[PDB]
Design a protein around this ligand. Sequence first.
Ligand SMILES: *[C@@H]1O[C@H](CO)[C@@H](O)[C@H](O)[C@H]1NC(C)=O
Ligand SMILES: *[C@@H]1O[C@H](CO)[C@@H](O)[C@H](O)[C@H]1NC(C)=O
Ligand SMILES: *[C@@H]1O[C@H](CO)[C@@H](O)[C@H](O)[C@H]1NC(C)=O
Ligand SMILES: *[C@@H]1O[C@H](CO)[C@@H](O)[C@H](O)[C@H]1NC(C)=O
Lengths: 213, 213
Amino acid sequence: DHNPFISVEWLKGPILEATAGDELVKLPVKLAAYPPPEFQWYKDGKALSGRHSPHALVLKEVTEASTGTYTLALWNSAAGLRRNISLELVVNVPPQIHEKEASSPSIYSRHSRQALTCTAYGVPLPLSIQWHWRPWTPCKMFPQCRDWRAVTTQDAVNPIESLDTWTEFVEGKNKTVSKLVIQNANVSAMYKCVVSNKVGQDERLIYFYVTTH
Amino acid sequence: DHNPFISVEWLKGPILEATAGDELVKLPVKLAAYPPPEFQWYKDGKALSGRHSPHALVLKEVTEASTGTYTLALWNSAAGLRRNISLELVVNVPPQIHEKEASSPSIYSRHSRQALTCTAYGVPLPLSIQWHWRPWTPCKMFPQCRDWRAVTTQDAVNPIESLDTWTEFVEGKNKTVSKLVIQNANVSAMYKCVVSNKVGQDERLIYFYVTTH
Ligand SMILES: *[C@@H]1O[C@H](CO)[C@@H](O)[C@H](O)[C@H]1NC(C)=O
Ligand SMILES: *[C@@H]1O[C@H](CO)[C@@H](O)[C@H](O)[C@H]1NC(C)=O
Ligand SMILES: *[C@@H]1O[C@H](CO)[C@@H](O)[C@H](O)[C@H]1NC(C)=O
Ligand SMILES: *[C@@H]1O[C@H](CO)[C@@H](O)[C@H](O)[C@H]1NC(C)=O
């Protein structure tokens, strides 16, 4: 009937996921309109600079800061037509264990009590941290060894005083924290804490070298 | 005499410094040539994409990965002229104390021995870490309090067993590590470690809360 229109919808939407570090991430819409409408992309309320397409907003490289609400505004003034569509960007982050970045003791005093701590952040937040152990022996089958055993009360290489996992607020972020407390440092061993979400995994190796003073 | 030439030199050079996070960093040269020469920018041997000026290469945003050797190659084939000039980019990094990112004990057992550790990386690497202390009292004069005292053997709030600083290889980086060992956790106090280079400073606060069990 020759009448102007603006139709816009998600390809699937309203939520789109990308992993931190992904380049050229498209935020697309299904847009059919006549005549070609005026438009403007926004993020969390504020306009966006540069030449864009009304069919897809392209993010050069996503970080955790790229997370937010992206809005396409379309209008045909002469026709009195207006359409707003919003896309929720979720940027997932592969988990990191922070103690890895910090110095760690090379020697542990025999018979002593020792606490081993792993702090992990990621998006989504990993809700558990798994502890594993292996003997103080070389590896035959090699980041991998084949003799790693889960840490339990049954057949522990060193007696376990405790093993707790919780959520803690650290540097403006909610973080998962696990602490394995060894009641007595009897024998050298290797421990590791492993953490995972849907977009990645991380491991911290602890060389639990034990000597007498 | 109408003869073609290519002359290129550093504005000051050969070394240019920028801080990690700086945007639109110019790597400029003093270039006088006739006729307009052909040219190509490289980084550490590999060519660079995009439209550039032979007068200055513009880096959109610098990171520690932006560090390297940037080379302008100029040539006038018909004249048989060739000129290569290299600029050394150094990207400084404000220091970070990694233990800040990780969980930290809220309570310390009275009379016990406790080690406090700060691990710092930065560009340039900070060569020292300063330890300070203040009483377990509220602050009148407030990230700042006015009663912080340097940590020494004279008038220590808790007896100091040791205080060592060294360099350690951690996660593929050389890092400065300082460990303050408190011989006896007699009294609650606040400690902090402070670290600095020419482009920044960082602090980690430790709430040394002491109780009897
Ligand atoms: C579309 O978004 C803009 C910017 O937030 C807002 O001012 C306007 O009211 C919206 N228009 C419609 C059609 O909802
Ligand atoms: C962390 O967890 C608390 C408790 O559930 C929650 O209320 C808060 O929104 C979270 N904080 C952040 C910054 O994610
Ligand atoms: C300039 O740099 C290029 C690329 O590294 C190299 O192949 C060429 O030999 C250099 N030319 C001159 C004039 O040194
Ligand atoms: C760290 O320090 C060592 C000892 O001086 C030095 O040889 C090495 O180049 C440094 N390593 C790195 C990766 O900076």
